[PDB]
Amino acid sequence: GIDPFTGPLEMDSALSVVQNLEKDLQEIKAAARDGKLKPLPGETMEKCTQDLGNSTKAVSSAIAKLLGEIAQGNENYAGIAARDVAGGLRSLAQAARGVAALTSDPAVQAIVLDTASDVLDKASSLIEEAKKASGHPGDPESQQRLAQVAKAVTQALNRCVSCLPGQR
């Protein structure tokens, strides 16, 4: 017993963060549906959508760090990058939910949150796969699937910024 696998536990911890992120927006989904949200127009939609785009590019850079090399047993960057994605996903979700709160149209509100939720959804399995890959001294299949799910996160991000209300 007594396993010293306490090195790359950052990924599992990051998974928890993302799983808290989905449940964060879970409350927000119901809230937006009800008509709660945070409709404070202090942050203008231009800024929220701008931040959303930056958040997108941020975590897109973060996933590239996860898809870089392989974590064999213990690795620090693997954990740091797992923290970096989590931060980007928070920023993503926070900007998206702001957009929904600023708009009064009961359609785009759900769409902006849904896409953000789809991001973290795929990002979850991104971390899940990475968790498994960290226990593999260079696994072929794990990295193949990891790359696929990484891009799925990117697609969701790109879809979120696309579904933003800009119909003028």
83 CB contacts (<8 Å, ≥6 apart)? 10, 13, 14
Contact 40, 97 (CB under 8 A): no
Experimental method: NMR
131 CB contacts (<8 Å, ≥6 apart)? 11, 12, 15
Q: Which burial class, exposed, middle or buried, applies to 162 when counting CB atoms under 10 A from its CB (0-12, 13-18, 19+)? A: exposed
Contact 122, 146 (CB under 8 A): no
80 CB contacts (<8 Å, ≥6 apart)? 10, 65
Tokens of 66: 């996860």
DSSP string, 112-146: HHHHHHHHHHHHHHHHHHHHHHTBSSS-HHHHHHH
User: In the chain, helix, strand, coil percent, each to 5?
Assistant: 75, 0, 25
Tokens of 83: 């923290």
Distance CA 157, CA 160 (A): 5
For 91: left if phi > 0, alpha if psi spans -120 to 50, otherwise beta; the answer is alpha
Distance CA 156, CA 115 (A): 6
Q: Which burial class, exposed, middle or buried, applies to 7 when counting CB atoms under 10 A from its CB (0-12, 13-18, 19+)? A: middle
DSSP string, 150-163: HHHHHHHHHHHHHS
Q: Which residues pair with residue 135 across a beta bridge?
A: 72
Class of domain 1-168 as given by CATH: mainly alpha
